[PDB]
């Protein structure tokens, strides 16, 4: 029985491979030779956020591009004013081993989680301004690796149990369960319309999920090692992923295959975070070599390097308006970068 | 400075005072990590240090030794794959590694786990406290003679007891020979690399002796002193 099932699976895999190869008529690198190069990009540190005591693990930007939340393993979730650097709130966490945080699109709630397997949501618009745990989501059998708010009542979460779930804050129970991964789900990225989202796991594979239907549509296996970071193209039709193989790969949903690979021989360290600019031309990816690089999404050439961190850049986030880029490292300091003419 | 900006600056100063208080409380405390297979008496030592004080994801047990607060975390509900969440403990004071010395057939698994934890990219500067737990069972098994380490470890036939051995007065030469052989097998893996930036502190434990807290306290003190000394480039 198992032999026939494995044979059928291999046959279907070969069929999918042939279908993908038949449509591979031209590569992005070939047609992009006639586009003007971006050239060297220089960015300086405009703000230096300090106050954290442990290695910063994750951060997220607000819809207004003004407030940002940074999560550190010291048991604190602080909100920083990107303009004046003044802190707005210092939420004390019950679990010190936090690994991810999320800022609601409306700016009313903030989520966080980590090795505790619980997604703690805090309200920022309480009646007396006293931030408190609004709802605690439990049920995952693995460390909470990432979470992103879909609305003021729904949130998608990833866990190390190779499973993702769609939570409801009002009731506090899973609405939809997304399965199919074999490794620990590191992070996910929601599409601009919040209808579809992609997630990576520790199996060199990335899958596309439907929030309303809950069924997997496409699976990308272009990487060679665990996929740590992932970001969606501004249009919602492509996405890039960072892995420990020191190589980024751009995948398209329509083509169902990789478009471009970003790697350099001198780079042999794993990738930590990736993000797409407002236009998508600049692919900013963090690395474990204590610095970050800016890759040309169309030319696959190193346009710049955002160095100045004392440790690996564990997180990276770009504002909704692209005015600046935030990069956090394990040195407990968060740097904000922005170019000038 | 406008009134809104002044209120924001006042709130920021209050948050900074709170963060300074938290910084004092944090630097005044230490953290620890408890590792080991299921066959080891991890829960035993946990309960021992808990009752004396001197789904879930991660458990936490707080105990005090000589007015010094210590925080030991034990993995209660997590997936078998540990390559990811182990990186979170790359800044702990020490890693308490408990091993079942009486489990010959699984001793190789513990050795491989210790080798993996030692040669990690991010744990290069984290010390590991090796607890050879369950010594009574090892002594009983050695005295019985039914199972011999020669089968699981052929090189044991040529091993001799170290000269600096300090065995328990009423200890049989075979028991001390076997326990020191296990200790040296673990040390050869611990001493195979590291360049002296992180050390290992082996100890003989039974999961019931009340001195485990004192041993951990001494290990943490030694580690902190060696770290302070390395800042001055004396080591």
């Amino acid at each position, epitope marked *: 029985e198992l032999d026939q099932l494995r044979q059928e699976a291999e046959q279907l895999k070969n069929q999918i491979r042939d279908a993908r190869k038949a449509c591979a008529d031209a590569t992005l690198s070939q047609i992009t030779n006639n586009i003007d190069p971006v050239g060297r990009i220089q960015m300086r540190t405009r703000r230096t956020l300090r106050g954290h005591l442990a290695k910063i693990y994750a951060m997220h930007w607000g819809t207004d591009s003004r407030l940002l939340v940074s999560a550190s393993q010291d048991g604190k979730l602080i909100i920083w004013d990107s303009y004046t650097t003044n802190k707005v709130h210092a939420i004390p966490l019950r679990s010190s081993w936090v690994m991810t945080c999320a800022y609601a699109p409306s700016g009313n709630y903030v989520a966080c989680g980590g090795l505790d397997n619980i997604c703690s949501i805090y309200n920022l618009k309480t009646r007396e301004g006293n931030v408190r745990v609004s709802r605690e989501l439990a049920g995952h059998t693995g460390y909470l690796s990432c979470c992103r708010f879909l609305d003021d009542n729904q949130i998608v979460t990833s866990s190390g149990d190779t499973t993702c779930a769609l939570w409801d804050i009002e009731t506090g129970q899973q609405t939809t369960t997304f399965t199919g991964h074999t490794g620990d789900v590191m992070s996910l990225s929601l599409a601009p319309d919040t209808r579809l989202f992609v997630s990576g796991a520790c199996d060199a594979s990335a899958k596309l999920w439907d929030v309303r239907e809950g069924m997997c549509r496409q699976t990308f296996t272009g990487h060679e090692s665990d996929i740590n970071a992932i970001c969606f193209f501004p249009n919602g039709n492509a996405f890039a992923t960072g892995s420990d193989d020191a190589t980024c790969r751009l995948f398209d949903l329509r083509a169902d295959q990789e478009l471009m690979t970003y790697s350099h021989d001198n780079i042999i360290c794993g990738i930590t975070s990736v993000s797409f600019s407002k236009s998508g031309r600049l692919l900013l990816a963090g690395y474990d070599d204590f610095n970050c690089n800016v890759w040309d999404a169309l030319k696959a050439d190193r346009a710049g390097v955002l160095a100045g961190h004392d440790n690996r850049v564990s997180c990276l986030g770009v504002t909704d308006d692209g005015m600046a880029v935030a990069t956090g490292s394990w040195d407990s300091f968060l740097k904000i970068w922005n170019g000038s003419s | 400075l406008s009134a809104e900006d002044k209120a924001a600056v006042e709130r920021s100063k209050m948050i900074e005072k709170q963060l300074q208080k938290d910084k004092q409380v944090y630097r005044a405390t230490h953290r620890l990590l408890l590792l080991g297979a299921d066959n080891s008496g991890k829960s035993t030592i946990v309960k021992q240090m808990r009752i004396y004080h001197v789904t879930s994801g991660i458990f936490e047990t707080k105990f005090q030794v000589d007015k010094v607060n210590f925080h030991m975390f034990d993995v209660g509900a997590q997936r078998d794959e540990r390559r990811k969440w182990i990186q979170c403990f790359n800044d702990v004071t020490a890693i308490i590694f408990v091993v079942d010395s009486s489990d010959y057939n699984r001793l190789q698994e513990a050795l491989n786990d210790f080798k993996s934890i030692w*040669n990690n990219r991010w744990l290069r500067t984290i010390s590991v406290i090796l607890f050879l737990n369950k010594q009574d069972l090892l002594a009983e098994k050695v005295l019985a003679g039914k199972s011999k380490i020669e089968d699981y470890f052929p090189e044991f036939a040529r091993y001799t007891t170290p000269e600096d051995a300090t065995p328990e007065p009423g200890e049989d030469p075979r028991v001390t020979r076997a326990k020191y052989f296990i200790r040296d097998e673990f040390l050869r893996i611990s001493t195979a690399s590291g360049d002296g930036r992180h050390y290992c502190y082996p100890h003989f434990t039974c999961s019931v002796d009340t001195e485990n807290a004192r041993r951990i306290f001494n290990d943490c003190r030694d580690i902190i002193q060696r770290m302070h000394l390395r800042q001055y480039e004396l080591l």
Partner: nanobody
Amino acid sequence: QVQLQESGGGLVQPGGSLRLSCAASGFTFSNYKMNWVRQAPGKGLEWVSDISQSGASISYTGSVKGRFTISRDNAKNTLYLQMNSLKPEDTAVYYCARCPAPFTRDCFDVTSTTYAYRGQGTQVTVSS
């Protein structure tokens, strides 16, 4: 896609010889460490041997020390495990596992219940 296809197995008399093979594809075989794992009937996965990137440093478990020989061909991207003087206790499905990350010295969870970068293994039964 990363895939490992082990080879070699079947009935083998105790004390004889048997040569296993594994085909590597989907990655730079030279940039990853290779480790051998087996699962005996009624027992869990156990580490057998490992080979470095260039093959300079090689180690074996005490149960197979001096009995098995592990070697890799960076050109052919194939791993070999020359097994001689087999014993009835060696009956187990040998699985080939790869280090999760490249340019590293630690194989954290190669011997895990649900490792991703491992092959299906081959049946090895040592019975007279």
